[PDB]
Amino acid sequence: GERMVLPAGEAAAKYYPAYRENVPKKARKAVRPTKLR
RNA sequence: UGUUUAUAGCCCUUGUUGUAAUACGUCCACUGGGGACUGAGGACUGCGGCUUGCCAAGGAUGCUGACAUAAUGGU
């Protein structure tokens, strides 16, 4: 998460405020075709 | 009024169709719908299924619209 991995003159992202921004858990819902009347 | 299938029939017993059907009881790791409430958790770990990726498998996501309002909510 340091700068050697992602070095730039502007950084990969300009600013890193606040908490870690918790990623949602990987859902297990898959879209399937609707069975119509 | 009286008799025993006749110009109606019924009952009892036995065979065949029959290994009949239906009801009831029971089970299916068989199946088709309709309605309601709930979405806690938050990278990855697991147990499974499928065929390495996928999956309804250790708790909801997806696609849209209206309003962006005093609408919802509070007093």
Task: Show Cβ contacts of residue A3 under 8 Å, excluding neighbours closer than 6 positions.
Answer: A11
Q: For strand B, which nucleotides have at least one atom less than 7 Å from a protein CB?
A: 33, 41-45, 54-57, 59-62
CB of A36 nearer than 7 A to strand B: no
DSSP assignment string, chain A: --TTTS--SS-SSS---SS---PPP------------
* A15 close to A21: Cβ distance less than 8 angstroms: no
Q: How far is the CA of A10 from the C1' of B35 (A)?
A: 57
Among candidates A30, A4, A2, which has minimal Cα distance to A16? A2
Count of alpha carbons within 13 angstroms of residue A32, beta-carbon side: 5
Q: Report the distance separating Cα A12 and Cα A7, nearest Å.
A: 8
Experimental method: cryo-EM
Resolution limit in angstroms? 3.1
B58: residue with closest CA to C1': A28
d(CA A27, CA A25): 6
Q: How far apart are CA A1 and CA A12, in angstroms?
A: 11
Distance A14 CA to B62 C1' (A): 32
